[PDB]
Design a protein around this ligand. Structure first.
Ligand SMILES: Nc1ncnc2c1ncn2[C@@H]1O[C@H](COP(=O)(O)OP(=O)(O)O)[C@@H](O)[C@H]1O
Ligand SMILES: Nc1ncnc2c1ncn2[C@@H]1O[C@H](COP(=O)(O)OP(=O)(O)O)[C@@H](O)[C@H]1O
Length: 203
């Protein structure tokens, strides 16, 4: 089974994907997480991707498509989390899959209003050395665990990221909907309620 998680930044896609991957046996492919590892390591990909990410822009399609080709699991269930982000990426993903006799089975759209988005991203905190994700209000970090606020989670960059999402990524909603595999999630609910919804659509 192959799932795509789609939705605005801050919708809770990474949170749900980690939980679903651990509980139900999916390989979790986070382009954000893989890109951030590339950046800390200073690989050619990391060095190039870094400037787009800082400005809240999407990293060029060709880099992302090559990345997915490089990391795509040979067997097993997969959650693509934050990929595809563009129509070209979605077309490339369908093409890779077809040559493997595979296909995207469900696309889950994590619907949440912009105001909720802004609140979630503004309050997002990360353990920089483990990657674990927190929220200063909805899931606070215990005292004496060091957390940072990601630089792209600043108000100006959030604004840009949301604009980018609506322009380039939102068209994927209609792209997948016309394949008949789109399922809607109310991602504005608390974590446990969102997770219940996730299990429902894929069951
Ligand atoms: N259902 C939820 N309700 C409230 N806060 C959430 C929920 N899901 C995630 N969060 C918090 O919101 C922020 C964004 O979550 P994340 O999973 O990083 O979103 P995405 O991967 O879609 O960008 C994080 O700080 C996370 O702890
Ligand atoms: N599939 C992708 N295509 C292009 N850029 C990507 C992709 N995935 C991640 N990125 C880059 O990584 C940044 C952060 O990614 P991600 O961890 O998915 O952030 P968030 O979960 O907050 O949206 C994006 O703003 C973008 O610059």
């Amino acid at each position: 089974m192959i799932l795509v998680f789609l939705g605005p930044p801050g919708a809770g896609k990474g949170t749900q994907a980690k939980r679903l991957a651990k509980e139900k046996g999916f390989v979790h492919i986070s382009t954000g997480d893989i890109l951030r590892e590339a950046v800390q390591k200073g690989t050619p990909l990391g060095k190039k991707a870094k400037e787009y990410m800082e400005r809240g822009e999407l990293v060029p399609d060709d880099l992302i498509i090559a990345l997915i080709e490089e990391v795509f699991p040979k067997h097993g269930n997969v959650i693509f989390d934050g990929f595809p982000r563009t129509v070209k990426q979605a077309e490339a993903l369908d093409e890779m899959l077809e040559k493997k006799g595979l296909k995207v089975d469900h696309v889950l759209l994590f619907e949440v209003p912009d105001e909720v988005v802004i609140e979630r991203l503004s309050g997002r905190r990360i353990n920089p050395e483990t990657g674990e994700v927190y929220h200063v209000k909805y899931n606070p970090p215990p005292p004496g665990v060091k957390v940072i606020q990601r630089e792209d989670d600043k108000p100006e960059v959030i604004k840009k990221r949301l604009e980018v999402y609506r322009e380039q990524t939102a068209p994927l909603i209609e792209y997948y909907k016309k394949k008949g595999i789109l399922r809607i999630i109310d991602a504005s609910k608390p974590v446990e309620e969102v997770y219940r919804q996730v299990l429902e659509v894929i069951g």
